[PDB]
């Protein structure tokens, strides 16, 4: 088990493109990969479970992941969250 603890910080959080991505990069690992937030946890890799968190600018989420490439999976949602999914 890989985790790490994370700000959102583009302008719509977990919303509209940022949330595509987010979940277009959670599927590419074979890993199993969650997402809390204020004692809610939900499937990385779902959208509707995604949205139902109601992640805005500012708000920090803790992210989990257990298998084979568990560490790689990590790695990448870190990297995209800190170019701001592709923002200034």
Same mark, same amino acid.
């Given at each position: 088990?890989?985790?790490?603890?994370?700000?959102?910080?583009?302008?719509?959080? #977990?919303?509209?493109?940022?949330?595509?991505?987010? !979940? =277009?990069?959670?599927? +590419?690992? /074979? %890993? =199993?990969?969650?997402?809390? +937030?204020?004692?809610?946890?939900?499937?990385?890799?779902?959208?509707?479970?995604?949205? %139902? #968190?109601?992640?805005?600018?500012?708000? !920090? !989420?803790?992210? /989990?992941? &257990?298998?084979? *490439?568990?560490?790689?999976?990590? +790695?990448? #949602?870190? *990297?995209?969250? &800190?170019?701001?999914?592709? &923002?200034?």
């Amino acid at each position: 088990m890989k985790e790490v603890t994370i700000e959102i910080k583009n302008k719509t959080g #977990l919303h509209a493109r940022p949330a595509a991505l987010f !979940v =277009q990069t959670a599927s +590419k690992f /074979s %890993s =199993q990969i969650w997402v809390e +937030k204020d004692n809610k946890k939900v499937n990385a890799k779902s959208i509707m479970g995604i949205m %139902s #968190l109601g992640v805005s600018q500012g708000n !920090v !989420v803790k992210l /989990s992941a &257990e298998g084979d *490439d568990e560490e790689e999976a990590i +790695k990448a #949602l870190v *990297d995209l969250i &800190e170019s701001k999914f592709g &923002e200034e």
